[PDB]
Amino acid sequence: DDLLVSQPDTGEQALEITDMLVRSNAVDVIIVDSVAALVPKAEIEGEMGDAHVGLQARLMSQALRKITGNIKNANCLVIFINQIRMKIGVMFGNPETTTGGNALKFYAS
Amino acid sequence: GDENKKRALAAALGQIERQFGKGAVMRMGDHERQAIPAISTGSLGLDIALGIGGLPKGRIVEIYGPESSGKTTLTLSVIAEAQKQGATCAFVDAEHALDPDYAGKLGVNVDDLLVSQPDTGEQALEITDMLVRSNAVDVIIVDSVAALVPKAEIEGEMGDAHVGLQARLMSQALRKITGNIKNANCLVIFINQIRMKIGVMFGNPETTTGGNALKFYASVRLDIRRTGAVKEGDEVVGSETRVKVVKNKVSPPFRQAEFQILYGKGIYRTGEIIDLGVQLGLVEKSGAWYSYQGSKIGQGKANAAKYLEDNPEIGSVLEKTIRDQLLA
Amino acid sequence: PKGRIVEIYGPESSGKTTLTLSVIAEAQKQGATCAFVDAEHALDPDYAGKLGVNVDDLLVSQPDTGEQALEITDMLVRSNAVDVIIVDSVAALVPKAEIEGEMGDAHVG
Amino acid sequence: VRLDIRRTGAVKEGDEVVGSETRVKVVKNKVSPPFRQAEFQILYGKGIYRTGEII
DNA sequence: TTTT
DNA sequence: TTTT
DNA sequence: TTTT
DNA sequence: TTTT
Numbered sequence: 001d002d003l004l005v006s007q008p009d010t011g012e013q014a015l016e017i018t019d020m021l022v023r024s025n026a027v028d029v030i031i032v033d034s035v036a037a038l039v040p041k042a043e044i045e046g047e048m049g050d051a052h053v054g055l056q057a058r059l060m061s062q063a064l065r066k067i068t069g070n071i072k073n074a075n076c077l078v079i080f081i082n083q084i085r086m087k088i089g090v091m092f093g094n095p096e097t098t099t100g101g102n103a104l105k106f107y108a109s
Numbered sequence: 110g111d112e113n114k115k116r117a118l119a120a121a122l123g124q125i126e127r128q129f130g131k132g133a134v135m136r137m138g139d140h141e142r143q144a145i146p147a148i149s150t151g152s153l154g155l156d157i158a159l160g161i162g163g164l165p166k167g168r169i170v171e172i173y174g175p176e177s178s179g180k181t182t183l184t185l186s187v188i189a190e191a192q193k194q195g196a197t198c199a200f201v202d203a204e205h206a207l208d209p210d211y212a213g214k215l216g217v218n219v220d221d222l223l224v225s226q227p228d229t230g231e232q233a234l235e236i237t238d239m240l241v242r243s244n245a246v247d248v249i250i251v252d253s254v255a256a257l258v259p260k261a262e263i264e265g266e267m268g269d270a271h272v273g274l275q276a277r278l279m280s281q282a283l284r285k286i287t288g289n290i291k292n293a294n295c296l297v298i299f300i301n302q303i304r305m306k307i308g309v310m311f312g313n314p315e316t317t318t319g320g321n322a323l324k325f326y327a328s329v330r331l332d333i334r335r336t337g338a339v340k341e342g343d344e345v346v347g348s349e350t351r352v353k354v355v356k357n358k359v360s361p362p363f364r365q366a367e368f369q370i371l372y373g374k375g376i377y378r379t380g381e382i383i384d385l386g387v388q389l390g391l392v393e394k395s396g397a398w399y400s401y402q403g404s405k406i407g408q409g410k411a412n413a414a415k416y417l418e419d420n421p422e423i424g425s426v427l428e429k430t431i432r433d434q435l436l437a
Numbered sequence: 438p439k440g441r442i443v444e445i446y447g448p449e450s451s452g453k454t455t456l457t458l459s460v461i462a463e464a465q466k467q468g469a470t471c472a473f474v475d476a477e478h479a480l481d482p483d484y485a486g487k488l489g490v491n492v493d494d495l496l497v498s499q500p501d502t503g504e505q506a507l508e509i510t511d512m513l514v515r516s517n518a519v520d521v522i523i524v525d526s527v528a529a530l531v532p533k534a535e536i537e538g539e540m541g542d543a544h545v546g
Numbered sequence: 547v548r549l550d551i552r553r554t555g556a557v558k559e560g561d562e563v564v565g566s567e568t569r570v571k572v573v574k575n576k577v578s579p580p581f582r583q584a585e586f587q588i589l590y591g592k593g594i595y596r597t598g599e600i601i
Numbered sequence: 602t603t604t605t
Numbered sequence: 606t607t608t609t
Numbered sequence: 610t611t612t613t
Numbered sequence: 614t615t616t617t
């Protein structure tokens with residue numbers, strides 16, 4: 001009961017509401033699940049199988065860029081959830097590889 | 110003839126001196142320094158790679174590499190050396206991530222330091238410009254350039270197409286600030302992440318962020334790559350750091366150096382000095398058994414490091430000859 | 438060719454900067470009076486000296502503003518005493534109007 | 547007259563790198579036909595690798 | 602009179 | 606004036 | 610600015 | 614972003 005739910009149909013709306021609430025500074029812990037499940041609206045408007053490779057990364061990087069200062073301001077708790085995708089030519093090093101771009105781990109403390 | 114040309118040249122130079130002052134002509138003896146003033150990084154491998162034994166003053170330097178490569182804490186060694194020099198330094202971070210306890214473990218005096226938490230990138234730029242011109246600050250550190258965002262994108266919604274905007278403004282910023290940076294001989298570093306761009310299968314797949322003119326203005330660029338880590342027994346205690354010179358104007362490039370980075374303590378100076386001493390012939394080693402001056406100092410890096418830390422004078426004498434025989 | 442504008446462009450760090458120095462060395466060989474101005478304010482006199490050019494017989498410039506770079510270039514060219522004139526990093530040149538303006542202000546064109 | 551400069555490759559002697567191969571292509575001229583691109587090596591410190599091109 |  |  |  |  002003492003919890004606010006969200007059912008964001010599009011990832012962009014999830015980002016806008018997260019930004020609005022973090023700045024509200026009223027919320028104290030912020031939880032987003034299944035980052036990989038987030039989809040840019042450009043891919044939604046596109047058909048099935050269209051090549052929109054390397055699109056979610058730029059927008060999520062922009063989102064963290066915008067939100068990190070406010071997150072520091074409010075001392076809020078933000079977690080992220082990623083699945084595992086084994087990428088091509090990964091036989092050297094760790095075969096597992098995270099999703100959701102690359103700058104996420106750079107920003108994540 | 111020649112006297113007429115000399116007289117005309119002297120007249121023109123005198124007019125320039127009258128209008129602008131001493132800045133027309135370099136001082137024929139004072140403008141000539143045998144050695145360029147610089148700031149050592151605390152690792153002689155990096156310094157000898159730099160070819161001047163320290164980071165050049167008044168010149169932009171940039172570092173890029175894969176995420177979580179210890180570049181952030183790499184800057185802290187430079188901060189500690191600047192504090193050792195007593196130079197006034199300040200730190201600004203765009204990602205707004207900093208652990209003052211972590212830095213204090215690195216030995217840098219966090220108190221003698223100015224922090225910054227710039228909510229917008231434009232304010233980070235304005236404060237950097239204001240401080241550089243103050244000329245009071247001596248080393249300037251900006252982290253996570255990619256994390257910097259134009260205010261236009263902030264005012265815009267999520268997913269709006271503002272492509273090719275940060276580059277123009279950062280180019281303008283460097284354009285404005287480079288002259289002052291030369292004026293104050295201050296130390297400015299930049300931090301970039303790596304983004305693999307489209308259609309890059311030829312050449313190097315990796316590509317830096319933050320536009321393109323950055324590398325043009327930066328007088329020296331270093332690549333940092335995480336190759337391995339050192340594990341003592343079961344637990345992991347430090348990460349092996351590989352840094353390769355990728356651009357320089359004062360030294361030959363591609364002078365890559367190897368060194369270990371130990372958490373908390375910082376740079377594993379004893380290991381690198383031991384390695385270069387034994388490889389150069391200063392430190393004799395009968396095969397795998399480490400020794401010095403015919404004395405069984407110990408076997409293994411830890412024993413020699415312990416033997417060396419208790420006597421800083423011996424280490425200072427050992428390092429003094431290395432730079433002289435290599436740098437100069 | 439003499440008395441004619443010549444321009445060089447290319448990707449960053451392509452040795453164009455040191456490419457100019459060979460021209461400087463040849464001009465010095467001719468005994469022609471030459472001067473160098475750099476907008477990016479990056480120059481390694483040790484590096485150039487390694488290139489064989491006599492740095493002593495050379496006039497340096499460190500123009501804080503682009504307008505002053507232009508005024509000094511105009512003054513020297515008309516002096517007619519100088520014979521080869523080198524300006525580096527034209528893009529690094531900035532109008533004083535943009536200097537007086539804040540960060541991110543629209544001074545396009 | 548306008549010249550384009552492009553970094554194609556670099557010369558490596560043994561392990562270390564010592565110079566960069568420089569490709570310059572003529573892109574505009576009024577006294578000579580354009581597109582007379584030339585190949586030459588640039589060696590750090592020493593400068594232009596004149597012997598190689600003349601050979 | 603472009604600009605990334 | 607790129608960008609993933 | 611990757612992606613399976 | 615695996616695949617038999």
Ligand SMILES: Nc1ncnc2c1ncn2[C@@H]1O[C@H](COP(=O)(O)OP(=O)(O)OP(O)(O)=S)[C@@H](O)[C@H]1O
Nearest residue numbers: 106176177178179180181182183208211348372373
């Ligand atoms: N407080 C700390 N305690 C223990 N180890 C630390 C601490 N801070 C950093 N490290 C270690 O130091 C190494 C690099 O971390 P830092 O230099 O502090 O940050 P950074 O990774 O360089 O910054 P990035 O890469 O841009 S996220 C890693 O091996 C970390 O585990």
Ligand SMILES: Nc1ncnc2c1ncn2[C@@H]1O[C@H](COP(=O)(O)OP(=O)(O)OP(O)(O)=S)[C@@H](O)[C@H]1O
Nearest residue numbers: 358359360361362450451452453454455484566590
């Ligand atoms: N002092 C130096 N020591 C060693 N190599 C140098 C030195 N200065 C320049 N180089 C090399 O010369 C080549 C081109 O560098 P420079 O001509 O000096 O500068 P530049 O790169 O032309 O100027 P830019 O491209 O506008 S940053 C590169 O291969 C550099 O590694």
